[PDB]
Amino acid sequence: SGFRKMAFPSGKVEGCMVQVTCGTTTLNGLWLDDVVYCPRHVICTSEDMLNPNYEDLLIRKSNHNFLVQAGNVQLRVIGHSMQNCVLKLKVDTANPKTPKYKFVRIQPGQTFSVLACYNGSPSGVYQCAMRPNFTIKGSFLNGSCGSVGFNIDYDCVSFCYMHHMELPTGVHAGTDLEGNFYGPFVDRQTAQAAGTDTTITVNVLAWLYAAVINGDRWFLNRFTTTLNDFNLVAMKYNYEPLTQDHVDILGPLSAQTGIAVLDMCASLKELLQNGMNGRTILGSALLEDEFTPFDVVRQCSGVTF
Amino acid sequence: SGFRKMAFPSGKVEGCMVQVTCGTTTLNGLWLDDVVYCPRHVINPNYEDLLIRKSNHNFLVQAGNVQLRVIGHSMQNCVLKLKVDTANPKTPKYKFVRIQPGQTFSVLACYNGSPSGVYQCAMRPNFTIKGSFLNGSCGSVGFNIDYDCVSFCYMHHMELPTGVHAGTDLEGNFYGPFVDRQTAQAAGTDTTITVNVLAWLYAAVINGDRWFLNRFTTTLNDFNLVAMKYNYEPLTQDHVDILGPLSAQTGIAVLDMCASLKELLQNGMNGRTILGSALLEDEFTPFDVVRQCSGVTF
Ligand SMILES: CNC(=O)CN1Cc2ccc(Cl)cc2[C@@]2(CCN(c3cncc4ccccc34)C2=O)C1
Ligand SMILES: CNC(=O)CN1Cc2ccc(Cl)cc2[C@@]2(CCN(c3cncc4ccccc34)C2=O)C1
Ligand SMILES: [Cl-]
């Protein structure tokens, strides 16, 4: 019993974190085999950030301009190239602690663990979700750039995020491990703002099924709804549209609890209208949206209480 | 910016987790040097009588896909110590420490000697932890990291009827009035960790959330009279001293922040949130707030 925001064990990722320095800029890199991956803005000064020409800044660099530190050992850079917004530094030593890994691009609503690092040293691990507006509500200070997001389903680490910047509202933006940003963001200091954020509806439903599994049904009602009527109501509360894909994905949780997805949608409609009236669901007074259907199945018991 | 429930990086602890099997019971063990530590319930129980009937080969210890050979066994309080023939090459610098209620720690949840997740939690005033544990999680450990040293503070033993969890320090002494056996046991009435709520109010102010601040102050006695009525733990002079650095960083005296907490208790949040929460959060200590808002690494 119990329901916690759980992160993946970070050990496989800790063994990959290095410090990358180029001139006066210092950030984190990910050392996998003989390549160190890091944000390309490591080659920029604060002035360069307004309108950086990365190709022009990079062509003036040689291998020995990049200082890579793994623990207390200096790695030798023997090559460098740019792939989108990530810089790839070829080093002379392959990481002996390289885990089995993949680079995956995630969609909004997906969750992942973040290993927050400073100077190539890990400081903490937390769980978060890719918001519908492609930002993440992380906890990052200056020097955290290059920290990574990942999932570890089975013995394989799936790297999905690399931290690049903080937006004016305090939220964060970054890239997949191929250097493509999530969202309409650029690694440039321009007028950039997070779009209006919405609640991840399929995740709230999954978390309501998790409350039922752990023994709580106070929020259920005798009503059902059509998919269209639920979406008309949900969009009035800044909730993301629920698609047929989402309904299909919730099938296993619907079968385990005996509550149809459109019947759980009717409870959600009523919770949005009424609030909670001094009650909580899984120790929370707000509707939680950073647990996917897959996360609920992984954490919760197979036997409903 | 941002404020998250952050756990310590679990890597140093992952390299210590093993699977321990005795007959039909399977749980997790902590392999440090040549000793594996695990709950003694792996064996109305008379533990000395159950233990005397077991030989070394009755305990099956698995580290990854390698079988460790048990060469000795002894009991220390509610913890079984299995001497193995191989020292853990991944043993970190470590200490066994007993924590006090209100203190937080990271939990590496394991099943069959394999870590599945990591989360942060606090030792409640009633000595229980609101964890996330299923059958097979026994022997999962709680810890903190201070520089390069792992301080092991908790080993999971059982779940109470309300869904909360109970366990021991690494010397086998339970936290709380709990016993390792099937009998009528219940978590006591819980209280809110006041010094932790204040620390989290300071973290919100650091992150630019100040709507709850006011021009008022309070005495320590008047604040405690109010707090005792909302099932909040008493705030001591030690707690005020401990909040000093956060008070100096934000420019808000501790008794000034206490007056904001008093108004939040007597009047609610009125449709507003603090750090994305509609409840007053008490599982971040003053040190946790300082560490997360300063970037301390391990
Ligand atoms: C908040 N941003 C700024 O003051 C200027 N920043 C422009 C800028 C523009 C584009 C890119 Cl791709 C990077 C960047 C910087 C690089 C570092 N950085 C940061 C990242 N994470 C968390 C932070 C927390 C506090 C202060 C800075 C943080 C940025 O956003 C710098
Ligand atoms: C809920 N407990 C029971 O039904 C019986 N339990 C008696 C019992 C008596 C004494 C001791 Cl020291 C342990 C125990 C058990 C051993 C395992 N265990 C559990 C631990 N964590 C999480 C669990 C989640 C679900 C079911 C069991 C869990 C217990 O409390 C089992
Ligand atoms: Cl995805």
Swiss-Prot record, chain B:
Localisation: Host cytoplasm; Host Golgi apparatus; Host nucleus
Sequence position, cross-link Glycyl lysine isopeptide (Lys-Gly) (interchain with G-Cter in ubiquitin): K5, K83
Free-text activity regulation comment from the record: Inhibited by pyridone-containing alpha-ketoamides compounds 13a and 13b. In turn, alpha-ketoamide 13b (tert-butyl (1-((S)-1-(((S)-4-(benzylamino)-3,4-dioxo-1-((S)-2-oxopyrrolidin-3-yl)butan-2-yl)amino)-3-cyclopropyl-1-oxopropan-2-yl)-2-oxo-1,2-dihydropyridin-3-yl)carbamate) inhibits SARS-CoV-2 replication in human lung cells. Inhibited ex vivo by michael acceptor inhibitor N3. Inhibited ex vivo by compound 11a and 11b.
Gene encoding the protein: rep
Organism, as annotated: Severe acute respiratory syndrome coronavirus 2 (2019-nCoV)
Cytoplasmic side: 1-298
Active site (record annotation): H41, C138
Subunit and interaction comment: 3CL-PRO exists as monomer and homodimer. Only the homodimer shows catalytic activity. Interacts with host FBXO22; this interaction promotes the proteasomal degradation of nsp5.
Recorded catalytic activity of this chain's protein: TSAVLQ-|-SGFRK-NH2 and SGVTFQ-|-GKFKK the two peptides corresponding to the two self-cleavage sites of the SARS 3C-like proteinase are the two most reactive peptide substrates. The enzyme exhibits a strong preference for substrates containing Gln at P1 position and Leu at P2 position
Protein's name according to its UniProt entry: 3C-like proteinase nsp5
Effect of N135A: Does not affect ability to cleave and inactivate human TRMT1
Domain of life: Viruses
Effect ascribed to mutating P125H: In strain: Omicron/BA.1, Omicron/BA.2, Omicron/BA.2.12.1, Omicron/BA.2.75, Omicron/BA.4, Omicron/BA.5, Omicron/BQ.1.1, Omicron/XBB.1.5, Omicron/EG.5.1
Peptidase C30 domain sequence ranges: 1-298
